[PDB]
Ligand binder design. Sequence first.
Ligand code: HEM
Ligand code: NO2
Ligand code: NO2
Length: 153
Amino acid sequence: VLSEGEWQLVLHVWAKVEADVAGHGQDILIRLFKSHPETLEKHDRFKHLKTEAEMKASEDLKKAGVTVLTALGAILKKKGHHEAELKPLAQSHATKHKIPIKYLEFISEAIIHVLHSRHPGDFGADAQGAMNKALELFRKDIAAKYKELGYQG
Ligand code: HEM
Ligand SMILES: O=N[O-]
Ligand SMILES: O=N[O-]
């Protein structure tokens, strides 16, 4: 559990993300791919990209970032009561895309990095700690679902 104040910290900084979902998505995916290049291999449409500029110019990458953040924002807004939203995501990520937990850790790291970089006043120790808890809970619960589906990733 997060407290209600922790949830509110999460959603307060999220509202900043919602002002420009695509640009935040671009920064987060580029951070993920630069930090953990093996992750890029999972995206057949754009796995050939090399430079930061190429990544910024890619329509497909920009769409992917919005796809992620739209889903994740809907998850966060449930304040832990997200089983229904996690169900389809676990299904595709376990059985189709095969995204291991370690990669969800990497993207969680990238999200934290970008929020700290862009919104430090809204991302002090309080809010960092609350977002860390929120993303940990997402990963815990998705991991259980993965296993239910037969995927030990
Ligand atoms: C916060 C974590 C994540 C969220 C909320 C998320 C969400 C989504 C959603 C909503 C879709 C479209 C529907 C679906 O196929 O389920 C999608 C597709 C996909 N996801 Fe994720 N995702 C996450 C993390 C990741 C990571 C870390 C990777 C790869 C390293 C990944 C790889 C893919 C792939 C390969 C697709 C298919 C389309 C594509 O190639 O771009 N996802 N994801
Ligand atoms: O690489 N996240 O889709
Ligand atoms: O709590 N989600 O499976």
